[PDB]
Amino acid sequence: SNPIQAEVLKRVAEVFDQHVPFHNLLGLDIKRYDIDGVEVAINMKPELIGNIHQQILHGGVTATVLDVVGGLTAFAGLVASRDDWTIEELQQRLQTLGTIDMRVDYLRPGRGQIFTGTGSVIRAGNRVSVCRMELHNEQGTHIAFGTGTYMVG
Amino acid sequence: SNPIQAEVLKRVAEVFDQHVPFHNLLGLDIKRYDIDGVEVAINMKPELIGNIHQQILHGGVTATVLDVVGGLTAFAGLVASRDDWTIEELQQRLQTLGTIDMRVDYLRPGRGQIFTGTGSVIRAGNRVSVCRMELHNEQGTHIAFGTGTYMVG
Amino acid sequence: SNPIQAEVLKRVAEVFDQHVPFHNLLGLDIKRYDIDGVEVAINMKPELIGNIHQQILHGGVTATVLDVVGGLTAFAGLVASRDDWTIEELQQRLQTLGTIDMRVDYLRPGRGQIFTGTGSVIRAGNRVSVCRMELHNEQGTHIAFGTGTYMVG
Amino acid sequence: SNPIQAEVLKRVAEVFDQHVPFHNLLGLDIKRYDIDGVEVAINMKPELIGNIHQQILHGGVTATVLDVVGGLTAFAGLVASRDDWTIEELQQRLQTLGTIDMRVDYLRPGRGQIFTGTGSVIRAGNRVSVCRMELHNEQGTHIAFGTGTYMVG
């Protein structure tokens, strides 16, 4: 794709990946990131448990992962929408990026070894975008669905 | 509250405040928990930051706090709804207690030193309850509102 | 499907299709209803326009259609839940069927002569079910998505 | 409110009260509309019933009223946010007014003779605003609560 569109796609992906303190506290990793769909994985660890008896992931981790998948999905959508994007142009956008509201639907108990989240834009906007997100375990079992409205400009 | 109601609440409160791995990871504390509702407090700390430049809370922490406030608010309301609960029935309820769906509305940037969450029951049920949650910093400004649907039976 | 199930689904269908005053005012029709799900449809007419200057469907209609699709989807999923329902049992359930909360995401302005809605269960339950709903124009594009939490018992 | 603000508001109130086909079909009325907010009312009539036996308002009507209250609430909050507003500058804004997403929480059966709705802005913006809505009957009993995200620029 566009030389600049590539930079941001490999930069923004790395920004979220390790430049965010909370992402590091949880061990959240943005595996990939490109024009279509981003991916976010998180390995199960004792620190992420909610109910010790059921040994299930705390609902806050599920929410966090879905929110991150959405913002990234939204911004990625903004990027691919143009070929005139300058560097500062997108930098101002990235500083504006934020969640306005989000809905999480908890489908099944959060059990698994590795969890992966992905999303897609259902409403692409120049200022506001809405996406749907999803979280599953290594067995492919859907743990939760999400829908978020993001500010992209 | 009668002995049963009081004792159950005291027990649940220490469970959430000391024996929940994810709560310990973030520093989420149950400041107050009685038949009237809950108060959850969380001190800002570097690991909870979402964007270093603006020094704001990661939307994930906010969602986590709002969700916990809702669950406990819904459980407190359940306990308060009957004069004939037994320790065993309420202990079974605490295990079934869970979030079905939740909406978080991000109002302002999450800046603060100490964050406090409280909630109220807008729809009480024997099986399903709906709660409204709020999060504010030590200055009293609202950071986010939440609405949660919880399975309570 | 099963004699009783197909019999109950048949009954419930004419109910929403004709026994509901608001459905007749809007022209809401239950195009088809089987154990697999539902498909609602509604023809455009002058009384359903929201903004005359744009000849677009009023959002209130959209939300109405999504919610009905959701309740029907939920109940259908419940019928297929057990294989030994008694016509009286399912009659008691239908009396408790109702929406707890619903989220509507508006994607495009509603245009065209006919609008069709369908949905699916994302979380099946004996007491509560969560469904996703979709509404689209005659050209196949999605006007809105919906997510609903329903009481099925 | 200065003359310009009050002028556009009176104009907007007129359009929604008489020049909106779907509002005229339901009988939705804009009782009052000023810089503070909006009051929407709708009398109960046979055509608005959802369940014949319970004589309750159809959930679609409740959702319709909450969305309209939210839109007008959002627009009023926009009108009151500035003084440099020129007549057409706000009329161009009105053309952009629309609902992005909405969540409705059904608290209890919609019984009543006259239903009234009010709302407030929980997040005011130059392009996106979030609002809370509420519907009650003539006795003051709360029927449903809403939360809407609106495009205002």
Automatic annotation (TrEMBL), chains A, B, C, D:
Annotated protein name in UniProt: Medium/long-chain acyl-CoA thioesterase YigI
Sequence similarity: Belongs to the YigI thioesterase family.
Tagged with keyword Transmembrane helix: no
EC category name: hydrolase
Keyword list, A-Z: Hydrolase
InterPro entries named among the record's database cross-references: HotDog_dom_sf, PAAI_dom, Thioestr_dom
Keyword NADP among record annotations: no
Species, as recorded: Shewanella oneidensis (strain ATCC 700550 / JCM 31522 / CIP 106686 / LMG 19005 / NCIMB 14063 / MR-1)
GO MF annotation, one: fatty acyl-CoA hydrolase activity
Domain of life where this protein originates: Bacteria
CDD domains: PaaI_thioesterase (cd03443)
E.C. designation(s): 3.1.2.20
